[PDB]
Amino acid sequence: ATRDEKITYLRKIIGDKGSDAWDVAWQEGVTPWDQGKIQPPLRDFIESNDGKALVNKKSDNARVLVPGCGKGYDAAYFASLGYETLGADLSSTAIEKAKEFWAESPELKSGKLSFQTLDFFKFEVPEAKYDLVYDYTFFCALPPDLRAPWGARMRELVRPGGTLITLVYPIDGARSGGPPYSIDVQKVTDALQGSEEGSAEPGKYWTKVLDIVPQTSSPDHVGRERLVVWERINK
Numbered sequence: 433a434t435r436d437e438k439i440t441y442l443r444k445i446i447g448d449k450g451s452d453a454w455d456v457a458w459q460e461g462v463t464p465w466d467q468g469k470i471q472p473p474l475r476d477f478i479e480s481n482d483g484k485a486l487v488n489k490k491s492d493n494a495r496v497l498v499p500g501c502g503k504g505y506d507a508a509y510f511a512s513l514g515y516e517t518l519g520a521d522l523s524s525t526a527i528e529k530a531k532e533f534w535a536e537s538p539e540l541k542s543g544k545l546s547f548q549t550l551d552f553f554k555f556e557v558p559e560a561k562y563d564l565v566y567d568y569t570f571f572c573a574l575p576p577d578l579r580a581p582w583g584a585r586m587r588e589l590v591r592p593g594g595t596l597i598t599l600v601y602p603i604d605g606a607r608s609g610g611p612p613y614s615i616d617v618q619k620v621t622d623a624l625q626g627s628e629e630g631s632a633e634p635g636k637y638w639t640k641v642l643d644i645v646p647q648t649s650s651p652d653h654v655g656r657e658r659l660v661v662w663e664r665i666n667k
């Protein structure tokens with residue numbers, strides 16, 4: 433079937449089954465988002481001077497979370513940098529296929545990399561929280577009414593002074609419907625900064641330290657993508 437057809441179906445079964453539709457999609461092989469590798473802006477950020485700084489300052493027990501990790505390319509990448517890394521996905525099928533795709537990873541073998549079937553909204557945040565979290569094609573997978581809970585979870589998941597990286601894609605403008613929902617930095621901002629009763633005036637919970645157009649985007653991502661680095665505050 434075509435990509436449009438696979439997306440049309442995906443949106444059907446989400447309409448009928450809700451969040452259970454994802455493991456169905458994985459079981460049936462309707463995974464049109466799967467690229468087989470990380471997106472280049474992630475590696476370029478990490479190898480950039482800002483990224484080297486972030487990695488060099490990592491504590492000896494620094495922990496990474498990649499929610500909605502799918503086949504887990506991003507989690508495998510962060511583990512290969514020496515971070516103890518958990519890739520979390522709602523679909524047990526996705527998590528099994530991530531264990532297959534990464535079966536030869538030295539970090540999987542050692543346990544430094546770990547894949548687990550987990551609901552991002554429900555699992556128990558560890559006491560130490562996470563030093564670094566990476567969100568790619570997860571915020572844009574969620575229905576719009578789940579964006580505020582996503583930001584609330586994000587605020588609990590990242591330790592004070594820790595970092596959240598959002599590869600914001602797809603920035604398609606006013607197109608309606610999803611997945612993949614058309615998003616932008618403002619939508620990520622509003623979700624992450626939440627509200628303070630009276631208003632949502634930013635600088636409450638995060639500092640947006642970096643917001644760039646990546647220089648190396650996949651060709652179908654050019655013009656629809658921004659990379660954003662957030663630091664958690666209110667220590």
Ligand SMILES: Nc1ncnc2c1ncn2[C@@H]1O[C@H](C[C@@H](N)CC[C@H](N)C(=O)O)[C@@H](O)[C@H]1O
Nearest residue numbers: 454465500501502521522523551552568569573
């Ligand atoms: N509440 C949830 N908790 C954890 N994972 C979820 C949740 N809802 C949806 N997902 C997963 O989010 C993934 C969205 C995928 N389209 C993208 C996967 C991955 N980020 C990639 O770049 O390949 C799916 O694998 C879902 O199983």
Ligand SMILES: Cc1cc(C)c(S(=O)(=O)O)c(C)c1
Nearest residue numbers: 439464465569572573611612
């Ligand atoms: C969650 C989600 C779903 C889909 C179908 C896609 S994609 O087809 O555009 O690649 C992406 C990027 C994310």
Ligand SMILES: [Cl-]
Nearest residue numbers: 468469470505
């Ligand atoms: Cl990769």
Ligand SMILES: [Cl-]
Nearest residue numbers: 603616617618
């Ligand atoms: Cl934007």
